[PDB]
Structures are given as C-alpha cells and as structure tokens.
Amino acid sequence: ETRVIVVGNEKGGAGKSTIAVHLVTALLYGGAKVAVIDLALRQRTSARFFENRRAWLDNKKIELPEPLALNLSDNDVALAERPEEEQVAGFEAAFARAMAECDFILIDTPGGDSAITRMAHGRADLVVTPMNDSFVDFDMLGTVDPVTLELTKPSLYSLTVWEGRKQRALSGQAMDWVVLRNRLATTEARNRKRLEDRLNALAKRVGFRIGPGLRDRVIYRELFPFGLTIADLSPQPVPVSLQHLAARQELRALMHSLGLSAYSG
Amino acid sequence: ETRVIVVGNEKGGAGKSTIAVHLVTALLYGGAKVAVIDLALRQRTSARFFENRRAWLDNKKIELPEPLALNLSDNDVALAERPEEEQVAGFEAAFARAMAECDFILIDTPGGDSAITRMAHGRADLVVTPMNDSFVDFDMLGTVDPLELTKPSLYSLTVWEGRKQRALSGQRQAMDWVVLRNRLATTARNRKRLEDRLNALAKRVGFRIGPGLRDRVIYRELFPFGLTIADLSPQVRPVPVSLQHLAARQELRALMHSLGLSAYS
Ligand SMILES: Nc1ncnc2c1ncn2[C@@H]1O[C@H](COP(=O)(O)OP(=O)(O)OP(O)(O)=S)[C@@H](O)[C@H]1O
Ligand SMILES: Nc1ncnc2c1ncn2[C@@H]1O[C@H](COP(=O)(O)OP(=O)(O)OP(O)(O)=S)[C@@H](O)[C@H]1O
Ligand SMILES: [Mg+2]
Ligand SMILES: [Mg+2]
C-alpha cells in the first residue's frame, strides 16, 4: 500500500526532525523499508542525520539498516533559492520515485510555510505534530484569550492541516492527525495542566488526537553527529541504562499510538 | 546613539523570541525606551506577546512599561504572502520610524532565511544568538566531522555577510556577536563535547560565548498574559511564586551584563 507520514508543525523547534529520525530508525528495525524526504532545504536535519550515519557506518565498517534518503536536487541548499515551481518539481521527482520502492515515506518539514510543505500535507496518511509543553508553541495551533484564557479559535497551522484534508478530499479516501507533547521535563504541573485542558478542547474543534509525550533526554540528541539512535545501541558490546530503557519505552508507546505496533518489539 | 539589537539563529526553536521578549522587558525596566520589531511575519511571537500585554494590562487596569511595538503592515500574516520587495518596504517604514523615537531597537527574527532577515543583520550593533545545547542546533553554526570541526556553516555566513554589509557604512564600532546556550537542563558528556567545538568555532568566526539560560517554566508560562519575571512585583501576581524566580532574574541579569547593558539591570 505504501503509507506516507508527514511530521509537521509550523513552530520552530517543536521536535519535528527528532521524531522523524527516530520514526525512520524504528521502522527500519521492524523490517520495513523506509524512504526519508527532508523538505527543510537549507537546514536539512534529517538529511544531515543520515549523511552522518552513512559516513559513520562506513568508517567503523559495521552494518545497520539505512533508509532510502532522497534529495530534490544535487544541492538543496541551492534549490532553496530557486522559485517555488522548481522546488515543487524536485519534490515531485523524489515523492514519485519513493512511491515505487518503499512501504513508508517519512517526510520531515521545516518550521515555516512553503509550497512543498503544503503539498506534503495534502498527500499524507498520518500527520505527526510534536510540540513543546508551552503556550508559545500552542499559539500556532489555537488562539487563547489573554484575560478569560479560554480557547477562542483555530490558528495558523491548524488551518494548514485542515486544508491538507480538503486537498485529500478531491482524491476521496481518512487522515490521522496526532499531536504529542515533546521535551517534557519534571515539575511544570500548573502549566502542564492549564495547557492540557486547552489541548483537549482544541482536539474536539480541529480533529486531532493526543499522543504520548517524549521527555527531554540527552540520548535523543546526543547521537546526532554519528547518525545513530537508541534503536541502534541494543544488546542484540552493549551497556544498558535505566534511562536508555525509559527511552525505548516511550518510543514504543509512541509507535503503537500511531498504529505502527506491527513494527515495534 | 539609538542602538540596534538583532536576535538571530536560522535554527528553529533556538529561543530567539524568548530572549527578545525578556530583553525588551528588562530594558523597559531600566528606564530605556524600546521599540520591538517582529520579522516572523506569520508566527509573530514577540508581536503576539505584546498584544497580550496590551489586552491584559488594559483589563486589569494596572500599569506597566510597554515597548513601542511596530508592524510592517496592518496585517503581516497577509504581508508574508506578497513579494520580498513589499516586505522590505514595510521593514523600511518600521525601522526608519523607530530610529526616531527610541534608544533601543529590538528585532526578533524567524527561523529561516529572508530578505528582511538579511537586512536586519546588516544594520545591527549586537547579534544575540541563543542556541540549544545540542549538535542539531550547532550544525547551523559549524560543520563537524562524523573526528571534529571542519568549517563554518549556513548561519555563520549570514552574520559574516551582515558585517561585510556594515563595512560599506564603515562603522568603526564593529558588530558584537554573542552566542549563548539556552534551555539548559540538569546532567555532562554532551555539554562538554559541545563546549569544545563551541570555542573552536568562536575563534574561526568571531563571536563570544555568553551565559546560558536554563529550562524554566517561568520563561514560558506567562506568555498568554504578555508578562515576564521582570513584572512580578506584589501587585502583579497571576501565578504563585516559586523559589525558581530568584535564580531566573539572576541569569537574566548575568545575561544583560554580558551584552554590555549593565546600565539597565
Ligand atoms: N525529546 C527530546 N529530548 C531531548 N532533546 C530533544 C527532544 N526533542 C528535540 N530535542 C532537541 O531539541 C531541538 C529541536 O528539535 P528539532 O527536532 O531539531 O526541532 P524541529 O522541529 O526540527 O526544528 P526546525 O528547526 O523548525 S526544523 C534540537 O536541538 C534537538 O536536539
Ligand atoms: N530558557 C527557556 N526555558 C523554558 N522554555 C523555553 C526557554 N527558551 C525557550 N523556551 C521555549 O522553547 C520554545 C522555543 O523558544 P522560542 O523563543 O519560541 O524559539 P524561536 O527561536 O522563536 O523559534 P522560531 O522563532 O519558532 S524558529 C518555546 O516553546 C518557548 O516557550
Ligand atoms: Mg529540523
Ligand atoms: Mg518565535
């Protein structure tokens, strides 16, 4: 069937590239055959991750699953400068070509608005939208009243997904949308509550369902230079910590909630 | 003579808007007369902050310092769609008009690339560049080998060119560039590996490292009201006090000094 996952949030630093790289890496290890498309043309975090994996595995001469990384150009930083049309054309090539060869297409998007970004939301089966536990992030999903503090209306990014559905209702056939809270820390109780309320109210208005959070964790960020993740450090030498264990736990919970239980452990 | 501060990092979620809103608020309370310009045309986090302050102070009928918030349009979300030229024209109007009426101009920038963004880097006296303690963020400053540092990177160049553009108007008073680490958490190994590259890069690219902020609810918790710690006297209290407050106003102060604004703490 070939399912397409779009990781999205207009907000910067929501954790989009981090959830995408760990999604890919988990799927790979569930036998699946993944394609990774990175639409952050300049930053190219997912793309950079896997260039580092490539270069690393190579040097150490060990072997591990690699996705099928796909660029729009021979130089995307450069392509970022050409007009929308050329970017879209590039996307075209990369998407079409991945439809062929892969079971999942993982698309990581950038933290603003663009043609290719909008195009990706319209061709997606699942939209995973990680966010920070914070009203600053929440403001791209829904507008809250300063005095009352009631939610008040959907907001910029909500609309972006709402239109990526109307664009899937020309080719007729239901889009899962999951918002999960990422980089969770210790206390934050009062704020985590006020936020959790609006989060729910908004779900009813806009049609997403909340997934399980990840917590702030060095291991989610520490291995980027090598292009590795926790899913690569398994005992299957191997030093396992309580933290590593909590982490692969959360990832697993996450995987299930996205209905990818078929590919965990 | 009317100094201009540009908060910058191409990386999303580096903390730009959070450092800018607290800079403005600290300056205000040091007697200064600030202008706030937000070039994140869609998100408009700093602009949203102060619309909430406006609406909140109004409702509670209390009085507190407000900056001079400046829009490029009557609708910037809309302006985000017009061509570069029109955006730049809008900037023009807003910058020029703030040169007149203010001692500091605080410009918050978005987490990608744009004309107005590049224009702001060329007219800046100080560039405050907050980043996450993370190699993912670091990759927009400098490229590291999968054993170590090889070259400057996308955003380093953006500032390096905003200097060459200040070297037409020959400002003997060069541009100060400060990179500080933001959202610091508890536990060491990653914070060290990073701190090394951070220094090496400084020598190559010409910035100096400033004191970090730590991950703290209070830095994020008051956004809906458009308030900050600097507002939390006995009269203003929408939120119960924590021991955290003192450590917070501490870091802010340390920060302020390091940017040579000791005059306003
Ligand atoms: N659960 C987590 N635990 C620890 N670190 C995290 C976690 N999630 C994200 N990070 C780090 O947080 C920062 C933001 O994460 P990214 O995934 O890079 O965000 P993003 O949404 O891709 O941002 P852009 O720049 O808008 S794409 C990075 O420095 C990551 O290293
Ligand atoms: N020191 C801090 N403590 C706690 N939360 C923080 C801190 N710094 C930033 N945040 C939160 O981190 C997220 C990113 O910070 P922002 O200031 O929004 O980043 P940004 O650089 O404006 O990213 P763009 O503009 O969206 S790219 C927001 O949810 C803030 O509420
Ligand atoms: Mg990214
Ligand atoms: Mg912002």
- Would an 8 Å CB–CB cutoff place A84 in contact with chain B? no
Q: What experiment produced this structure?
A: X-ray
Taking residue B50's Cβ as centre, other Cβ atoms within 10 Å add up to 20
Kindly provide the b/e burial profile for residues B162-191, where b requires at least 16 CB atoms within 10 angstroms of the residue's own CB.
bbeebeeeeeeeebbbbbbbbbbeeeeebb
User: Contact B80/A218, CB-based, under 8 Å?
Assistant: no
Other CB atoms within 10 Å distance of the CB of residue B213: 22
Atom number of ligand 2 nearest to Cα B213: 1
Residue B147, CA distances (Å) to A226, A227, B128, B199, B248 in order: 10, 14, 29, 16, 37
Question: Ligand 1, atom 16: nearest CA belongs to which residue?
Answer: A15
Strand partners for A178: A128, A209
Burial of B86-121, coded b for 16+ CB within 10 Å and e otherwise, reads ebbbbbeebbeebeeebebbbbbbbbbbbebbebbb
What token pair was written down for B199?
């220094």
For residue A18, the SS3 value is helix
Note down the domain range covering B110: 1-265
DSSP state of B28: H
With contacts defined as CB-CB under 8 Å, which chain A residues touch B108?
none
Which residues of chain A make contact with B80, given a CB cutoff of 8 A?
A: 113
With a 6 Å cutoff on the Cβ, whether A44 touches ligand 1 is: no
Q: What are the tokens at A206? A: 């806009």
Supply B115's token pair. 């004309």
Q: Using DSSP, how many helices (H) and how many strands (E) does chain A show? A: 9, 9
Nearest alpha-carbon partner for A260 in A6, A21, A1, A30: A30
Q: Could you tell me if B17 lies within 8 Å of chain A, comparing CB atoms? A: yes
Assign B123 to helix, strand or coil.
coil
Residues in chain B: 265
For ligand 2, say whether the CB of B213 is within 6 Å of any of its atoms: yes
Cα nearest neighbour of A194 on chain B: B221
Torsion angle of the four alpha carbons B41, B45, B47, B49, in this order, in degrees rounded to the nearest 10: 170
Q: Is the CB of A48 under 6 A from ligand 1?
A: no
The total of structural domains in chain A comes to: 1
Q: Is B125 in the pocket of ligand 1 (CB under 6 A)?
A: no
Residue with tokens 């452990």: A265
Q: Which has the closest alpha carbon to B41: B129, B149, B115, B130?
A: B115
Q: How many helices (H) and strands (E) does chain B have?
A: 9, 9
Side-chain half-sphere CA neighbours of B58 within 13 A = 11
Interface contact flag, A45 B139, Cβ < 8 Å:
yes
Residue B182, ligand 2, Cβ within 6 A: yes
What values do phi and psi take at A218, rounded to 5? -50, -35
* CB spacing of A190 vs B240 below 8 angstroms: yes
Residues of A in contact with B192 (CB under 8 A): none
Cβ proximity of A126 and B35 under 8 Å: no
CATH code, A34: 3.40.50.300
**Could you tell me the resolution of this structure in angstroms?**
2.8
What tokens does A225 get? 């230079």
